[PDB]
């Protein structure tokens, strides 16, 4: 993906459910606020521990 | 909201393992369905006027899974989850060569130790190849958009 | 940060650990953190210094 | 099943075990009143209401897994 480098605080979340690997970030949705919105979903083959 | 399919080599011979409350070797060690969402299983056959899909060598599957620990006295099974693969699949190859194949791998002490061992068996092809499709539907994962 | 993921953990021959059998997931920031590359593929070492 | 770009020599640079400068903590906890580190709901949105929800959640005021990347040795340039 592409991302703009900034000075403001950012957050990332990673999880795995039955519909795949789920990556959440606030940059794509909320630059000056913050929330874990689904910006990526890998259709993964397996669950990673 | 979204749909999910899986497909696999399912002949009709073990079709009696299609039930929701099934606890057979395909249910125990291979896959278990989604109990919170509707599902459907379709067993189809290769048409004569269709060469778009290929035919594999033989039906192969697993029928046993055991985590023997380094003490060589404590053994624990595994429970497969919905749309999930056990660590049983991480050691078993993509196919099983013949019936009763033993696949084993050393385990680290933090994950249990000893040797993870699994047993695989097989079912040969019929006159025409049969495919198994499993569809699961979900309402609350994304936008209603399909 | 970069993240390597798998359900498999093994020790190396020298006594160290960190070996991940089969396919393994890697997420990598690139271009001073501008690229978000990721692969669940097979990784291989080599026996150099 | 795809391509992969191979760039340079297989002569890896020396790697050290020198965590003495690494291990120095920072008191940086989270807050639930300020709502730090909560996943947004994945299938529904709401407005000016209170919503019970079930999900994959952290604890509060967690120690964390605080690390930082350490630059290598560089004498001059
Ligand atoms: C989002 O959700 C929040 C909470 O769920 C909403 O906040 C409340 O919204 C309701 C709905 O409008 C408000 O209820 C209103 O109350 C009015 C009362 O009128 C009388 O009081 C007025 C002054 O209000 C103050 O004093 C009263 C009595 O002491 C208190 O109850 C109030 O909270 C205030 O402190 C006078 O000017 C007036 O002349 C009357 O004497 C009533 O007339 C309305 O019809 C309505 O029922 C409630 O007050 C809000 N609470 C707050 C602001 O603390 C919020 O609005 C929502 N936002 C949206 C929907 O956009
Ligand atoms: C990311 O960078 C490339 C090249 O710099 C650019 O073409 C692309 O538009 C950027 N992404 C977005 C979403 O604009």
From TrEMBL, chain A:
Specific enzymatic cleavages in vivo yield mature proteins. The precursor is processed into S1 and S2 by host cell furin or another cellular protease to yield the mature S1 and S2 proteins. Additionally, a second cleavage leads to the release of a fusion peptide after viral attachment to host cell receptor. The cytoplasmic Cys-rich domain is palmitoylated. Spike glycoprotein is digested within host endosomes. It is found in: Virion membrane; Host endoplasmic reticulum-Golgi intermediate compartment membrane; Host cell membrane. Glycans are attached at residue 2. Spike protein S1: attaches the virion to the cell membrane by interacting with host receptor, initiating the infection. Belongs to the betacoronaviruses spike protein family. Homotrimer; each monomer consists of a S1 and a S2 subunit. The resulting peplomers protrude from the virus surface as spikes. Fusion peptide 1 (FP1) and fusion peptide 2 (FP2) function cooperatively and have a membrane-ordering effect on lipid headgroups and shallow hydrophobic regions of target bilayers. They are considered as two domains of an extended, bipartite FP. The membrane-ordering activity is calcium-dependent and also dependent on correct folding, which is maintained by an internal disulfide bond in FP2. This is Spike glycoprotein. It comes from Human betacoronavirus 2c (isolate EMC/2012). The chain holds residues 243 to 291 of 1353 of the full protein.
From TrEMBL, chain B:
Residues 1-146 form the BetaCoV S1-CTD domain. Disulfide bonds join 65-88. Glycans are attached at residue 49. Specific enzymatic cleavages in vivo yield mature proteins. The precursor is processed into S1 and S2 by host cell furin or another cellular protease to yield the mature S1 and S2 proteins. Additionally, a second cleavage leads to the release of a fusion peptide after viral attachment to host cell receptor. The cytoplasmic Cys-rich domain is palmitoylated. Spike glycoprotein is digested within host endosomes. It is found in: Virion membrane; Host endoplasmic reticulum-Golgi intermediate compartment membrane; Host cell membrane. Fusion peptide 1 (FP1) and fusion peptide 2 (FP2) function cooperatively and have a membrane-ordering effect on lipid headgroups and shallow hydrophobic regions of target bilayers. They are considered as two domains of an extended, bipartite FP. The membrane-ordering activity is calcium-dependent and also dependent on correct folding, which is maintained by an internal disulfide bond in FP2. Spike protein S1: attaches the virion to the cell membrane by interacting with host receptor, initiating the infection. Spike protein S2': Acts as a viral fusion peptide which is unmasked following S2 cleavage occurring upon virus endocytosis. Belongs to the betacoronaviruses spike protein family. Homotrimer; each monomer consists of a S1 and a S2 subunit. The resulting peplomers protrude from the virus surface as spikes. This is Spike glycoprotein. It comes from Human betacoronavirus 2c (isolate EMC/2012) (HCoV-EMC). The lineage of its organism: Viruses, Riboviria, Orthornavirae, Pisuviricota, Pisoniviricetes. The chain holds residues 439 to 584 of 1353 of the full protein.
